[model samples]
Target: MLGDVERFFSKKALEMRASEVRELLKLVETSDIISLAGGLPNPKTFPKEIIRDILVEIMEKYADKALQYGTTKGFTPLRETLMKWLGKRYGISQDNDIMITSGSQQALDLIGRVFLNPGDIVVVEAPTYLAALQAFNFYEPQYIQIPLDDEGMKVEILEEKLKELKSQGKKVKVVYTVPTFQNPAGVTMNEDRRKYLLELASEYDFIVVEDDPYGELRYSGNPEKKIKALDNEGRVIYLGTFSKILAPGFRIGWMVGDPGIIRKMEIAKQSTDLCTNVFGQVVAWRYVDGGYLEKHIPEIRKFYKPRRDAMLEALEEFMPEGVKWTKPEGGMFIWVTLPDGIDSKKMLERAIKKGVAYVPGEAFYAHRDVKNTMRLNFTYVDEDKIMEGIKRLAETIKEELKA
Candidate 1:
């Protein structure tokens, strides 16, 4: 029976593999494991009171709609509320339409279904978001990876690649980026670079996909205008989540793009999940439309910043020579790079035995994954625990290096 299952599997099903982070989360759930593997946010800022009140309000005032099936385009109030909010904050005025998704992950997957063919080329950052890799994997694209720096993905290098692709007669279907305070790497693109990227997108005539889950959690440094905000043409597709600023359990996120694109994805999304959580959308709209969300953002910043500082301090004091890590101004993670010969994936087996768990970096890459890197989350653990976990994790690294 098992033999037949493998033999009968579709090519995509045959190729699907578990992400390093997804597999670690199973072991990470153990109480003994202090996991820095997932891109999870702190639960402290979930706005329980607001959510509870919103649920009651939805039932009291909008019960019929709340309990009923929603339109595939999403509830109107939420979409309108988002329009006003994005307009106010980012000065985003375009012909873009919005579609609610079960979560950003669903949006990512729907993107693959709507756009990607089996061999389409997708350009992504080297060491990008692991989950995006997992989502896009089902469609099977030839992923082109680019190196990034403190200033974020090298736009100059990207231009060179675009030219090369042109010369070789290859078309890049999408340029995907976690532009602001990026995931896994904790790097942000500068304003000039963001403009350069959009320019390149315009020049080469490819779509720009901007993922902005962590933009609002900044603790320091200046903010750059969102690439979606900078789009003179309707070439940029933006995805945002309620998971970070609101509740992850809400399972609500949205995409803003040209109505042509949104219309296509809406049909694709309908086949995927019928519609997103209707009640969740209602409650979220109530919370966001009432202006509570903007007011609640500062509280999340206050709760997370010190924890990021704490982790950085612990890493500086605990880690050994040749180890380097990104100092993120905001976002839930820090990226660590060990000495070249060390293997973070190998170190993880020993780490779990020592009661700490982390996601190895190899899974983030599309092609040749480097061996000496890992992504650590500071938001999930307390400040005091972050110190101890880093200590234990450092020791685990040391043991691996010595071995």
Candidate 2:
């Protein structure tokens, strides 16, 4: 009967746990639900006409290369474009090598694959990106969870732990962070703390992975300097993606860092997917080179800004007392913290029944220590739907509190 499939799994594979949040969210995927659970860009923002034109150009002009297998480091033209652009904007050294992957998700896994060793501690924000944790989990590494405040992960606390863990004979290998407009929490690390983080990385002797997927999607506030931009010593690995700015369907993400390690990652990537999609890479290159991506950023921000405002306004108008939430300057999520002891996971059932859905906050925490929270995505829903969804969520929370 093929019972107990656990026996067939490799020990590394066996270490993997299915994301409880994903399983729970599957229940609310129906069309009738006004779901705020997804981390999606609004469909209205995708530059479909431009992409179609780019695709046609690729077919007529470069189909041979576009349809063929690319190098592990990605298409050279795209890589060159990205390297120059990143250097110009973020101060990434022109000397640093760039390696493109399927998406930031694949880049996360590749980082874990190349760097993680059993028993090595990966210092991550307590409520960091869930998918990053999932990617790292397969490598069977230990975690050092750092809590966040309004300005993002407290680098001071991280420094203290680096000292403590070093004394305990623990090996802290990598500090993984989504520094700007962090996922789930949507908080940006300030310049002072970001510089401090790089300082700690130098002092503690660990790699810093800065995943900045939403840096270009900011609807408000001045931009903070990237950790990689501050890394003159080559200890920082910066990841950027076309998903938020361009489209997630392309699955084009790149990593820029010390050429030596990136070479190792390119080798690691050879067996992963051989290379990222060549067609996508070519299209992405044209899109960037032609300046479509740069021009599209403001349009994307404009499209989602109202939706963000709607959800924020609805929370202000309808959310009952004791329900507090983050007002992210940009990015897709607003994290709502329910009254103490009110479990957002348990409340999901009632919310779904009321035709609304959200990802429980506990899903974002590495240790599942907190439950009175949930992540709402304003970028995926219409402004009108966002208003209704927040109202429904408020009602569910009210009922949960009554219970």
Candidate 3:
């Protein structure tokens, strides 16, 4: 029995690592620490009143449907409402297609399952979203990091990588990206780079996973059209989420792509969970159709904008001379790069001891050149905590620098 069990685990499963942020979160939770680690929305922002009303309405009117298992794709009303929302906001038509997922994380996992094979090359931005890397890592694909700057991924470097891969006769399975308010960096891809990326995908003939979960919370700059909107060749697979805007517990998200690809994902979804939570979907549908999000988004924006400003202001007021952090237009996080030779991982332990915490940037990368970088989330904590936490984090960084 033990011998047979040895073969049961896949190589990828054996090599998998637990989420670093989550591990730190466990420590932070019990210690009264100010956590800027997880990309968690403030509980105060949730539409509790609306959710309560919706739940009561669903229980009273559609009790059977709310309680029963539903379609794999998702609740029809949610899909329809999402389509209209996308059309109005991003100009992406219903013809573009959509599939409701458990969350954007599941969407990423499904994409990996459907598209990647062992040894396939996946080009991602340097210090990309770690969860996506974890999701795709199960396929044992070779992950190549294309460098990024303030404008987003260096398109020239991406083009060179594509050409080099082509010259070596290697196929790039996908170029995974977070085009708007990217995790760990909080930088959105500019319009020029967006078009260039689409152009490169058209030329290279590989799919682009435009993973965007934070596009709607923009507080400063004008929102750009999604890469899917620029996809003349059906090369971009757009992933969207309700996790940021709504409750993450709902586990509701969506993917828009070619019907064929989505059909394959639907099958994969069937094999995985059969369908996402139907009750959640029904509630989400009711939430969206009822215009709750439209009203709530502004409230979220208001709450987060001040917190983001507070974090940045505190960073400026408290951080050491060499510490640099991203000034994001809108999103939950700000990426901070400590001075050269500083170790963020070590600094994190010191921060935890000082009652503040953040995620080190090394865990976000696929390979070994770890930078003196880290990510701080501003959405979960309050404005006062943002200031106090940054001050404590600054002290930690300063002490580490001295050491």
User: Candidates' TM-scores?
Assistant: 0.96, 0.96, 0.96
TM value for model 3 = 0.96
For 136-192, candidate 3 gives per-residue lDDT tens digits of: 878888988986687788889988878888899887889999978889899888989
Query: For candidate 1, lDDT tens digit of each residue in 186-228?
Result: 9898899999999998888999999999999998887679999
- Give per-residue lDDT, candidate 1, residue 194: 90
- What clash count goes with each model? 0, 0, 1
lDDT of each: 0.87, 0.88, 0.86
The alpha-carbon deviation from the true structure for residue 276 of candidate 2, after best TM-score superposition, in angstroms, is: 1.3
Select the stronger candidate by lDDT from 2 and 3. 2
How does residue 87 of candidate 3 score in lDDT? Answer: 80
Error of 2 at 204 (Å): 0.7
Model 2: C-alpha RMSD to truth? 1.5
**Per-residue alpha-carbon lDDT of candidate 2 for residues 1-403, written as tens digits (9 for 90 to 100):** 9799998988877767777777766766666889999887878899999998998898899999999987788899898999889878877788688888887789989999999887778999979999898888878788889988889999889888888988988758999999888889988888999889888888888999999999998899887788888888999999998998888898999999999999889888877877878998999999999899888888998998888889999999999999888888899999888889888888888888998999988888888899898898998788999999999988988888876
Candidate 1 Cα deviation (angstroms), residue 2? 8.7
Candidate 3: list runs displaced more than 4 Å: 1-8
